[PDB]
């Protein structure tokens, strides 16, 4: 995260770190959506251009963390993957359309003060909150700049951007399954996700029921916090039927 702040303890208790066994390494963010299911971006798991194609046993999830590097004994919980599922129409060849995957945990985890699932949006929540100018929050342990890295989880609040502005910021052909967020050049604030933040959550707090909803997945960006560029996020509600499919089925 670029131009974020250090998170408060327990501020994002659904945040999950995707962690490589060897070398023992931060790969991506992710999110806890129940006691045995983790949501992330497809490209954290399968990205042919980087030679990335992870199997289950290559990866761990670490839940309840705050420190990027330290093993947070008696706080974090390290979990192993039973199965990885990638949206079948995930497009890695072109624009990262349907950049979404589910991970099924070997064992259900106990919730705690630092471990707690986020809500997934329903149609009405999406239609209400996913509006240009409304802000969400992105968290992660990714890099502090393009260029380096944080000691603890970073947080930044970013506004959702009008779709035509998203489209005119890039040569990439945007789909209806993604949205963009970030401040425009003449706005006073800046901030962006950066490398190592992908697969983490873009959340919003409902003013109706006070609950946190995961509206996006950190998907891609060209650079980090460049003027006139914006981060792109997988549109979680648009893919919810696929989510519910998988879950009412494994």
């Amino acid at each position: 995260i670029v131009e974020g702040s250090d998170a408060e303890i327990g501020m994002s208790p659904w945040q999950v770190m995707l962690f490589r066994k060897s070398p023992q390494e931060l790969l991506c963010g992710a999110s806890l959506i129940s006691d045995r299911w983790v949501l992330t971006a497809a490209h954290c798991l399968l990205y042919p251009p980087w030679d990335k194609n992870f199997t289950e046993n290559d990866l761990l999830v670490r839940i309840g963390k705050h420190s990027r590097t330290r093993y947070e004994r008696n706080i974090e919980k390290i979990s192993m993957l039973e199965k990885i599922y990638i949206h079948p129409r995930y497009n890695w060849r072109e624009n990262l359309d349907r950049d979404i995957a589910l991970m099924k945990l070997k064992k259900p985890v106990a919730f705690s003060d630092y471990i707690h699932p986020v809500c997934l949006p329903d149609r009405e929540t999406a239609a209400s909150l996913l509006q240009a100018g409304y802000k969400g929050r992105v968290t992660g342990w990714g890099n502090l700049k393009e260029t380096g890295q944080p000691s603890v989880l970073q947080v930044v609040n970013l506004p959702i951007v009008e779709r035509p502005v998203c489209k005119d910021s890039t040569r990439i052909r945007i789909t209806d399954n993604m949205f963009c967020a970030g401040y425009k050049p003449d706005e006073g604030k800046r901030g962006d996700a950066c490398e190592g933040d992908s697969g983490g959550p873009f959340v919003m707090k409902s003013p109706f029921n006070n609950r946190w909803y995961q509206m996006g997945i950190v998907s891609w960006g060209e650079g980090c916090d460049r003027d006139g560029k914006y981060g792109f996020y997988t549109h979680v509600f648009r893919l919810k039927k696929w989510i519910q499919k998988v879950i009412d089925q494994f």
């Binding site: 702040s5 408060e8 303890i9 327990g10 501020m11 208790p13 659904w14 959506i33 919730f111 705690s112 003060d113 630092y114 707690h116 699932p117 986020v118 809500c119 997934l120 909150l129 100018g133 409304y134 802000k135 969400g136 929050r137 947080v155 609040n157 506004p159 919003m204 707090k205 409902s206 003013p207 006070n210 609950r211 946190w212 909803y213």
Partner: peptide, 26 residues
């Protein structure tokens, strides 16, 4: 069920330091 309600914040009626910025953007 109790999704999205944080043990250390919503479950204790405590606000985090920047959540107001989101609610204000609405």
């Amino acid at each position: 069920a109790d999704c999205g309600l944080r043990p250390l914040f919503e479950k204790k009626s405590l606000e985090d330091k920047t959540e107001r910025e989101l609610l204000e953007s609405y």
